[PDB]
């Protein structure tokens, strides 16, 4: 079992370079619109309290240099939507894939194509944490890299990257420009709140371990939903809901292990640790595979 | 720190479906040749001891069905090189990238594009282990999926997937049909040999840790190459060579921790969100991404 990303080709044919002033970062070129973080128009003295409406009104089309490979794209118009800037260009992208824009919830996973200067650098799998941050691998200039899923050759864009937080994690927006969580595109004192382990995902991963070869962690016990939550919250696990129990139903039915029986196994794993053993290759309980990801990989 | 694969677009464009009789798997379409495991001409009845030159002599061009997307490719010739089948087609691939066929060394990493029915399904990062297996994620029908590295628009293909071993690990060939490891494309009882941990990659990953926040494992001490290799033998770690040390040079500079200083640390032994010593990042992997 691997954390597997989606093949990135459909997104690669969309990545461009956007330069405004002395600042360069990445854009996403779909049809005749280039999307990028609006903070590309921030100046070095703007960074603490920029007024983006005032910064924008002072720009004309030619202040924005867009490059797709070696080809320069002529920007013919521009507007702002929440925290993303939309640059209208004279050419529709011939490589535009079937796509849609989605806003995802905590626990959801997606692939990230890390890019620099509009050129793709690497692809990895990621997840939206309950504190609305991303535990990414981003260097300076990665802004405008996007996160996505691919389902039936339609690309679901769910994340555009904006900034790094003090603890090394990352904040960004959906493709309508609205931030995940309470962060702002502003040099400021903001920090990610406390984060929880994603209980529904850990349970999905235990079922995946059963689907493959391992039953060593099961036990003969069961538990009520409330007792499970009272224990698991003592380890900073996210409370399990009735929705999460319904969601695990198909894996439960597939393996023959009731959801609350699997909850009993998890309670014990938290109590004992793994005692030198491994589950699917890991000595930690993994929480970035969803019930959907499990069914896909098997 | 994340396990990250190369962008896969240049390779996605080369994947086709190959059917011979009742069997289907994936092929690599470069210029006007499709590459795939020769065991696609095996049938269910003769899995135990195929005679491949015989099965191929009895074959004709029309025995092979090649589909690139929804376009059927007309096969105009067939040929075998070691354990890979080469199907000549009448159309060069307009999406062929700059490429080379390369053969990698144990401890080197590559990206894998897992496919089913010629269709790219996912991408992930792998390492060639010292027992010449791959700890991959491959379902039935993944045969024909390739591994690769990219070096400024040139795709170096290093792996084609053939089969799974009973421990759940995987065996394949380079693109010239030469197996990695003592494995045969036969329904036989073969197993992976004992697997050592890749010591130079573990050290590289510790340097990646120091480069980020994690510094707690460092110490004031140093070991000798020989005293460490004595501990390495105990714990089934690959012995460390002067070549491994020289290759970690750049990272030893960037941190001020000499290899034998880090080796003292590694002797004593969460470090990057892991409670295992990770050994599938090369020195080069660490320098990239960082
Ligand atoms: C203008 C604004 C909103 C303050 C800003 C400034 C710099 C960036 N960062 C760019 O690298 C960058 C910016 N523009 C082109 N590149 C980096 C970044 O977040 N440093 C933060 C440092 C503390 C205060 C807030 C910004 C970055 C590094 C690694 C991965 N992701 C992003 C992002 C946003
Ligand atoms: C003809 C030959 C060499 C015996 C063979 C037969 C089946 C396959 N396997 C195909 O899935 C497959 C084959 N052709 C189309 N699909 C599976 C496989 O490796 N081993 C079985 C056969 C060898 C002995 C025991 C297990 C497989 C591959 C990748 C991931 N999980 C399972 C590979 C090679």
Describe this structure in words.
2 copies of one chain form a homodimer. With 298 residues, chain A is an alpha+beta fold. Chain A has 8 helices and 13 strands. In chain A, the strands form 2 sheets. In chain A, strands 5-4-1-2-3-7-6 form a 7-stranded antiparallel sheet, with no helix packed on it. In chain A, strands 8, 9, 10, 11, 12 and 13 form a 6-stranded mixed sheet that branches. The longest helix of chain A is centred in the last third of the chain and has 14 residues, at 259-272. Chain A is elongated and about 70 Å long. Bound molecules: ligand X77 (2 copies). One copy of the ligand CC(C)(C)c1ccc(N(C(=O)c2c[nH]cn2)[C@@H](C(=O)NC2CCCCC2)c2cccnc2)cc1 binds at residues 23, 25, 39, 42, 47, 138-143, 163-164, 185-187 of chain B. The site of one copy of the ligand CC(C)(C)c1ccc(N(C(=O)c2c[nH]cn2)[C@@H](C(=O)NC2CCCCC2)c2cccnc2)cc1 has 16 residues of chain A, from strand 2 and strand 12. Chain B: Residues 1-290 are cytoplasmic. Chain B: There is a cross-link at residues 3, 88 (Glycyl lysine isopeptide (Lys-Gly) (interchain with G-Cter in ubiquitin)). Chain B: It is found in: Host cytoplasm; Host Golgi apparatus; Host nucleus. Chain B: Residues 1-290 form the Peptidase C30 domain.
